[PDB]
Design a protein around this ligand. Structure first.
Ligand SMILES: Cc1cc2nc3c(=O)[nH]c(=O)nc-3n(C[C@H](O)[C@H](O)[C@H](O)COP(=O)(O)OP(=O)(O)OC[C@H]3O[C@@H](n4cnc5c(N)ncnc54)[C@H](O)[C@@H]3O)c2cc1C
Ligand SMILES: Cc1cc2nc3c(=O)[nH]c(=O)nc-3n(C[C@H](O)[C@H](O)[C@H](O)COP(=O)(O)OP(=O)(O)OC[C@H]3O[C@@H](n4cnc5c(N)ncnc54)[C@H](O)[C@@H]3O)c2cc1C
Lengths: 592, 592
């Protein structure tokens, strides 16, 4: 009930009012980015009455995983950071229509575009080691021929043949020893046991940005945290259109008839203010389920208390489990929320400080004044030789509108959770905020004498334990994620980064916007094209650049210089294409 | 002073106000589509004051080659028809901002998009012969292996090696005997002696539409003629912004200093109301020259008088000639406006009638009621065995808002001008309107008894002799067309279908919009990306579809079934790619 498109024609075109939409209502389980984007699309393109749009949230506030607040009895905390790129096609379709809350007569897209042109993002230091020294080979990928061939063979493998395959199953030691693996696994938070299918999707989806993977030149960021820059403008727009925010309501089940001909949502069983109630649904009441959550059951610590580890299934995962009992076409949540290894990423941390010594130590590494208000680290700095495999970033300060001008807040995360640290020789899951800050300051090169004092009394570090933060990337098979609109579904859609759609990559905001938009368009039969995932993996020019970049800026003669079986094929093919447009294209892209 | 881009990010983004634009003015030579589009871009993105924008036109009305009027003392006349496609990226960037004059709160793009979704364009009869019989092989391309190989070898030839090369120089008899050549040469008005470079550009530019070349399923049309649907909305927008239309002013020269460091336009020498005057220019007065015109020196006939042939250089060609004397970087107009062969297309015709016999004869061929207001012929019908190589179309009737509801107007053109017709055994350039109508009705299958009466007294046919209508496609070399902004030019730009820009194809409205937009962006340093020409020739999927379609829907096994040198290579390559994503892609596109 939809079609994919690309180009300006379908981008600038407005859809006609969908049929019978004046007699339809919408209920969105959750208030993360997916549900908010779907509500926005229901307003703009579906032309649905705002009062007929119900957003059900269990927390006190909207946003979801794009949070960012001065949590009372703690401090400033951002559960993550949002790297963004130009080719978030659906997200930019969305946010060009959302008024910015910072610039008059300007969209969120306008503010973002002008900002990332004023202060472009780039890293002057990406990988450090030995307590604050930049990696000597920072910039190069250092991939052997076997590692490059393994990358290509992963891309050349059909997705259908990658069910439950792990990343270590399709890569050997040269790849894991390469700088490429450092950059890739830290900027995308991949683990060695994660889904090779999703890694292949990532390789094909961002292949146009390989030249900017090491220096983060392809990344783009908002001014503030994603709650103030993305969530609040969207919420203001939706409220100005009368959208119905219902807070502190927990959905436990959705009664759905799965017949031989239809799948129809009949009832929303909810818990509002401790009272178990029911929402009866007709065929004209669409339900958008954000199945699963990476932030569910998050616990919080403080400067002197670790965030208590948990294995608790919340409302999101129990709701997906309850929906899976009604049809296998609704997915298998256990593949994502169970058997998460102990080593997996769990803990994030936000360390706030105004101390000049820490800020100056950061300036000495990132080469930029962290209080200047512009780019600081340009993205995560990775401590290569850290036992926790730790990375940290400082975005444009301050990430909060009402943060003091002399403060900075640093986001820290670790890929390995069950390993003794190098300074604090305990696993990160047993560390308070100041202890994470201590282990972090140790790798900055701070003198061991000052580390403990500067961490405990000069910094306020809030830690966060998310038991499902790596859940997106767990090894999966085709069918474990429900289709955005399952077969014969009449009024039920699955959105968010656990739904199934082609080619696009999860753990991205664009995936949420895409699933929201596809769900709305399919359920309402909106007569407008959906922007396909950008066609970079099919672009000959982009693939030529990929070959040039993966081989550390070498032409075809240098790549094949160490084998006769390579040299002969290259010479024959070159004579075959001599003096043609193919040769000119290869020369234009530095491959000849 | 510009960059190319693609995707929604740069499409929806607005540019900041360009620097120092409040102290700048603009003068546009001509009022065709290029000048109007450039004025629109100066208003919207350059944010230039409308009163500082001067559009100089020598004719009484604006529009140029997009005309369409009830010419007094004659009849209805459209000098041509405008086939359009979805991937006119720059044009759709433009017209999404131009308010439609037919639908409230809707752009021209909105009206066009909704209309071509309501009444999609497709032909139920494309090629006829033997006085009104549909070609038996209508639909198939009927290309031999040699013809397909010649097409690919033209595409694989560097553009730089195609200077002054003719189409007959890179094609043999199989290609010219193919139905592909019929469709291609008639829908694009290519002649055998025309530029092979431009034919290669056409092959690469519309390769995504090969599946819809025979039935015109990829074409899209406005509601009315291009003067009422495109020109009038643009003019209304520009006037609502205070743009300065100066009519009946003929530019004869532009005094330009071409120094070792700069090219600066100093003076506009004009003839306004018979008075020779001068317009002094500073560096902040940009000049946009529409160098050359395909409609210049057009003569008109009537039902009983031929359009008098002419070789006269008008104001456009003499102005381009005068500019060429000042620098070779400004092009060589003589390559386009001299040595036009006698055989070339010169004559168009608009035959209007309300006679039921002619309309019913048309319904019997095109299978649609020509007075229904929807699609009629879906594009040009080509009379294959006509000596004039004649084609004709009937767009959605009526093409004029104030045309009687019982009338239709048919556009007719002929590729060969110096050949005796099959019924009227004179060349078309010696035929009155009714005589062209007679030769046309003869190929419809009208009984010879009624042809002459129905043409002379039941129809009103206006003919038009354009000595330069084929000028776009004349054999050219790199440098014969000036760059949109020549090197070191400070305030001079060349727009229209005789300027030079990469990859895009001339004889298209999109080329005019593209040159206008690139000129404005380069001269004003507008901080927004220009949409590149659509990347279809670099898209692996599109190229696979091209292979499948050119070979008349055959997979790789059928294509290679008649040679061992083909079979062996195919079998080896297939075993090399067996069970991979390459094999799956080839199967998805029906090549395996
Ligand atoms: C650490 C981290 C790093 C990130 N990095 C990036 C990055 O680099 N790039 C990028 O593009 N994006 C990034 N993201 C964003 C990521 O894509 C998020 O998933 C994004 O916010 C999408 O939100 P969502 O609505 O799809 O899911 P969520 O934000 O998880 O939505 C869940 C919401 O639904 C509510 N909910 C769940 N179940 C119920 C129920 N039964 N009843 C009521 N309410 C319920 C929850 O309370 C919550 O508000 C990151 C996120 C995190 C947490
Ligand atoms: C027969 C025909 C078929 C076509 N088919 C198609 C098609 O299939 N698809 C498509 O996309 N487009 C088509 N077109 C449109 C084509 O691309 C036109 O060139 C288009 O209108 C672009 O206009 P332009 O402003 O670039 O050139 P023009 O329209 O030629 O602009 C010239 C204008 O400038 C004026 N002028 C010139 N010199 C001077 C001077 N010295 N002083 C003052 N005024 C001057 C002229 O009077 C005229 O108004 C067709 C056009 C014709 C005529």
């Amino acid at each position: 009930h939809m079609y994919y498109s690309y180009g300006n024609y379908e981008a600038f075109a407005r859809p006609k009012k969908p049929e019978n939409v004046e007699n339809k209502s919408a209920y969105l389980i959750g208030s993360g980015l997916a549900s908010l984007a779907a509500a926005c699309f229901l307003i703009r393109d579906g032309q649905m009455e705002g009062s007929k749009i119900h957003i059900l949230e269990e927390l006190p506030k909207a946003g979801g995983s794009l949070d960012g607040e001065n949590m009372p009895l703690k401090g400033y905390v951002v559960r993550g950071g949002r790297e963004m790129e130009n080719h978030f096609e659906c997200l930019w379709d969305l946010f060009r229509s959302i008024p910015s809350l910072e610039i008059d007569n300007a969209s969120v897209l306008d503010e973002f575009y002008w900002l990332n042109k004023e202060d472009p993002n780039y890293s002057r230091c990406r990988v450090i080691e030995k307590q604050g020294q930049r990696l000597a080979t920072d910039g190069d990928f250092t991939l052997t021929k076997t590692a490059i061939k393994e990358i290509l063979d992963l891309c050349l493998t059909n997705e259908e043949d990658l069910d439950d395959v792990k990343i270590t199953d399709v890569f050997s030691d040269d790849f894991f020893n390469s700088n490429f693996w450092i950059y890739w696994k830290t900027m995308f938070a991949f683990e060695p046991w994660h889904s090779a299918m999703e890694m292949r999707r990532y390789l094909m989806r961002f292949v146009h940005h390989i030249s900017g993977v090491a220096d983060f030149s392809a990344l783009k960021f908002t001014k503030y945290n994603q709650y103030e820059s993305l969530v609040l403008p969207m919420v203001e727009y939706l409220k100005s259109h009368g959208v119905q925010f219902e807070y502190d309501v927990k959905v436990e089940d959705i009664k759905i008839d799965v017949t031989t001909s239809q799948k129809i949502a009949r009832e929303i069983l909810i818990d509002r203010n401790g009272n178990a109630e029911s929402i009866k649904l007709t065929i004209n009441d669409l339900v958008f389920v954000t199945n699963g959550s990476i932030t569910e059951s998050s616990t919080y610590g403080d400067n002197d208390t670790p965030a208590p580890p948990t294995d608790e299934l919340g409302g999101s995962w129990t709701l997906w489990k309850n929906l899976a009992r009604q049809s296998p076409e609704f997915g298998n949540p256990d593949k994502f929320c169970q058997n998460i290894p102990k080593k997996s990423w769990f803990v994030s941390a936000t360390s706030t400080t105004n101390n000049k010594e820490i800020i100056d130590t950061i300036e000495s590494i990132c080469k930029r004044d962290p209080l200047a208000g512009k780019t600081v680290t340009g993205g995560i700095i990775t401590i290569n030789d850290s036992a926790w495999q730790m990375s940290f970033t400082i975005n444009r300060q301050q990430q909060f509108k009402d943060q003091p001008e002399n403060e900075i807040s640093t986001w820290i995360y670790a890929l390995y959770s069950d390993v003794n640290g190098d300074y604090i020789k305990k696993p990160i899951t047993e560390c308070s905020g100041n202890e994470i800050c201590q282990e972090w300051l140790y790798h900055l090169g701070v003198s061991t004498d000052k580390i403990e004092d500067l961490a405990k009394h000069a910094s306020n570090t809030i830690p966060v334990y998310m038991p499902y933060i790596t859940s997106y990337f767990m090894t999966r098979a085709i069918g474990d994620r429900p289709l955005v609109v399952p077969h014969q579904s009449q009024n039920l859609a699955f959105i968010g980064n656990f739904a199934e759609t082609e080619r696009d990559t999860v753990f991205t905001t664009e995936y949420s916007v895409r699933t929201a938009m596809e769900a709305v368009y399919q359920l309402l039969n909106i007569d407008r094209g959906i922007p396909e995932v950008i066609n970079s993996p099919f672009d000959l020019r982009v693939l030529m650049d990929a070959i040039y970049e993966l081989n550390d800026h070498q032409d075809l003669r240098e790549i094949t210089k160490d084998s006769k079986m390579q040299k002969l094929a290259l010479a024959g093919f070159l004579k075959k294409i001599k003096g043609t447009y193919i040769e000119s294209l290869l020369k234009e892209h530095k491959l000849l």
